[PDB]
């Protein structure tokens, strides 16, 4: 059993606890500076014919690299997910993810999602923060998404291949992983208590 | 047409293919992460003959020493940066165009169409950390034996530039001269290599 938060203690995510059984190596063994390269092969979107602007891909990749750097050094929970993902996939170069810079937040983890992406692994990010914001439910009321939480959320999708909807849990394993990590990073935003907004 | 630093040993009959390459790779600024240069350059283990597989433990030993050499070269040598950066824009940013590391095998790099014909069209860079006669090179201070720093850099310059050692009207070739320039910028004591083959 690994660290958790008080907001998860009643009805913890079983799929997260199932995954904690697999990813047990919480030691820092990968170069924080190269986590972006281990994760991403190059630019790529959900639809293959649609090309990604080179300059946006560079803007997302650089901020991403810094978030992976901060997350890996401060959060033991994140290292376990990263380290395990390296043994299974990311050490192999052909099994890395495409970065859909500029496109809508999402990660191809479902058999349907891969059928929609021509069987291509994509993780779409954007910096539409500098518009209508997205909000999430907290014990302190709705809070706006910061790019740290948005990015981490989609990354946890990629490292774990888990989805947000979980039977009998209001958050799902990805949100809980995201919550655990951001707190270990010293992130102030309050935890997300439910996947769906009201 | 902006000539870059050279060595006193090259000014008479400088390598034209090196100076021709200096015109293309002109960005000497440090923009890549030195710690990840090995990842940009090498995808994984792989040898000259495809059926021959590489020992897992040896590949790790070469890749680790390599990573440290590229780190040293990239941070200290501007000439190396121009070659590394230029190689990144053209090929290594693309993941399918990266090199295989033939750890343990004899020093060599597939840069000629013939070399590729022998490797079934696979890009490989063979290194080793290995009785027989040691290897020596020509210097103004007499024969010198190769250190792994020079051996690795030499083969890497083959990969970054796709140039070969054989040059008409030059005794060294562009790869050797690049290697000499770089090792001096890295503060390497060994004397420059004045000729490819002994004369
Ligand atoms: Cl989502
Ligand atoms: Cl050679
Ligand atoms: Zn999600
Ligand atoms: Zn050579």
Author numbering:
A (entry chain B): 27 to 156, 160 to 227
B (entry chain A): 25 to 154, 159 to 227
From the paper:
Here, we report that the zinc metalloprotease T3SS effector proteins GtgA, GogA, and PipA from S. enterica cleave a subset of NF-κB subunits comprising p65, RelB, and cRel, whereas NleC from EPEC/EHEC cleaves all five NF-κB subunits. GtgA, in both its apo-form and in complex with p65, has a globular structure, with the catalytic core assuming a Zincin-like fold. The active-site helix (αG) sits at the bottom of a cleft formed between an upper NSD and a lower CSD. Similar to NleC, the active-site cleft of GtgA is highly negatively charged, and the active-site cleft mimics the shape of the DNA major groove.
The structure of Zn2+-bound GtgA(20–228)E183Q was solved at 2.6 Å resolution by molecular replacement using the coordinates of GtgA in complex with p65. No electron density was visible for residues 20–24, 157, and 158 and the C-terminal Asn-228. GtgA(20–228)E183Q crystals belong to space group I121 with two molecules in the a.u. that overlap with a root mean square deviation (RMSD; Cα of residues 27–154 and 160–227) of 0.2 Å. This is likely a crystallization artifact, as the elution volume of GtgA(20–228)E183Q following size-exclusion chromatography was indicative of a monomeric protein, and the disulfide bond is absent in the structure of the GtgA–p65 complex. In the GtgA apo structure, Tyr-224 is 3.9 Å from the active-site zinc, suggesting that this residue, which is conserved in GogA, PipA, and NleC, stabilizes the tetrahedral intermediate. The active site of GtgA is surrounded by a large negatively charged surface formed by αF, the upper rim residues, and the loop connecting helices αC and αD, which folds down over the incomplete ψ-loop. An overlap of the apo-GtgA with the GtgA chain in the complex structures demonstrates that this region clashes sterically with residues in the p65 NTD chain. In GtgA, the ψ-loop motif is incomplete as, in both the complex and apo structures, the lowermost strand residues Phe-131 to Val-135, which form the upper rim, are not in the β-sheet.
